[PDB]
Design a protein around this nucleic acid. Structure first.
Length: 372
DNA sequence: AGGACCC
DNA sequence: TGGGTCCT
């Protein structure tokens, strides 16, 4: 019936990794750069105006002192990301990754086992760990409150472990489903945690300022809802099911309307090993359609070392590209093809293997998928 | 192959 | 605007 889900969200992840590499970067405003962008920065620099995904220029003309480290090679970020996930899996096996810095853990079973260990007395001593959303009063006789509180305790144990064993700080949100857990994890933003009691669900959902802010409603859907006059969470909650169903599909429509009410029955999915491996690269439009495949040889280099390490082998390869011109807000192409059973068991072959797929066709990326 | 959505 | 996942 009722679940206890925790959402773990690491603070400015790349920055934390770069700060751990070179300690001299601490306290000093740090920004991690990829090409001409500052993807993320530590809180210090953030205090000085630096915002995530901001042009270097606008970043230095806002903080003419900001230090920058290149973060185009995701290798170390990716490695730490899995150590975090594995550490969480130790607490409970059902852990879902969302990007490199977020994880969802279904704590339901763990909470039950812990509660069954408590005696008819110490159950009244159950306390919360961290913040209680909207400073809501706890009712120790509400079984749902007790469960979420134990959930807050586990969350605190997880964050303490991440810090002690891995040197990382982060936020956590504890709630009855993934939607709410993710929305509440960020209420007290820096290295802290919050728990959501049922009675405050509407307050949390309505605290949002636009449907776009709801996890599960992307750039597209948002614009669709807008063209319909739906802008606030309450608009969506009160809109006609039928029309919404008749314009977004019965699937999408019924799902996002549930979300507007803070309802979300999606299960936390066990991520396990990656379903694919890939590396990209965007050039200043410097690929003459030919000879510029030496770049593809570079991508393959690292990948091959990665595809290797994992142990499993990929039975499919792919190549994706881009083209410069107008304002193509969306434009990618890729030629998918099977990988020779013999070559699976090295570059040379694969090189021209991608080369043919090449000709058949500002960015270039090789993706090894269909792992077995 | 391409699309939507997410960090 | 460097990676990923799942659905059509």
């Amino acid at each position: 019936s009722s679940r206890v889900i925790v959402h773990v969200d690491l603070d400015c992840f790349y920055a934390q990794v770069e700060m751990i590499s070179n300690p001299e970067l601490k306290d000093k405003p740090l920004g991690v750069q990829q090409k001409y962008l500052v993807v993320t920065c530590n809180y210090e620099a953030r205090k000085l105006g630096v915002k995530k995904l901001m042009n270097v220029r606008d970043a230095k003309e806002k903080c003419p002192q900001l230090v920058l480290v290149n973060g185009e090679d995701l290798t170390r970020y990716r490695e730490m990301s899995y150590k975090v996930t594995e550490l969480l899996e130790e607490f409970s096996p059902v852990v879902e990754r969302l990007g490199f810095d977020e994880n969802f853990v279904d704590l339901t079973e763990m909470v039950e086992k812990r509660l069954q260990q408590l005696q008819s007395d110490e159950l009244s001593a159950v306390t919360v760990s961290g913040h209680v959303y909207n400073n809501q009063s706890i009712n120790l006789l509400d079984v749902l409150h007790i469960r979420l509180l134990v959930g807050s305790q586990i969350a605190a144990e997880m964050r303490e472990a991440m810090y002690n064993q891995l040197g990382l700080t982060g936020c956590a949100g504890v709630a009855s489903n993934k939607l709410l857990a993710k929305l509440v994890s960020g209420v007290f933003k820096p290295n802290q945690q919050t728990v959501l009691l049922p009675e405050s669900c509407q307050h949390l959902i309505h605290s949002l300022n636009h449907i776009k802010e709801i996890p599960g409603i992307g750039y597209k859907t948002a614009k669709c809802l807008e063209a319909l006059g739906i802008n606030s969470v309450r608009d969506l909650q009160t809109f006609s099911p039928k029309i919404l169903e008749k314009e977004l599909g019965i699937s999408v429509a019924q799902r996002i309307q549930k979300l507007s009410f803070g309802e979300d029955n999606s299960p936390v999915i066990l991520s396990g090993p990656p379903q694919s491996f890939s590396e990209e690269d965007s050039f200043k439009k410097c690929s003459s359609e030919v000879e510029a495949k030496n770049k593809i040889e570079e991508l393959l280099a690292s990948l091959l070392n990665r595809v290797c390490q994992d142990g499993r082998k990929p039975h499919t390869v792919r190549l994706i590209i881009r083209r410069y011109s107008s304002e193509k807000h969306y434009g990618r192409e890729s030629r998918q093809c099977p990988i020779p059973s013999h070559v699976i068991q090295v570059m040379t072959p694969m090189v021209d293997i991608l080369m043919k797929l090449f000709r058949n066709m500002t960015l270039l990326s090789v993706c090894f998928c269909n792992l077995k």
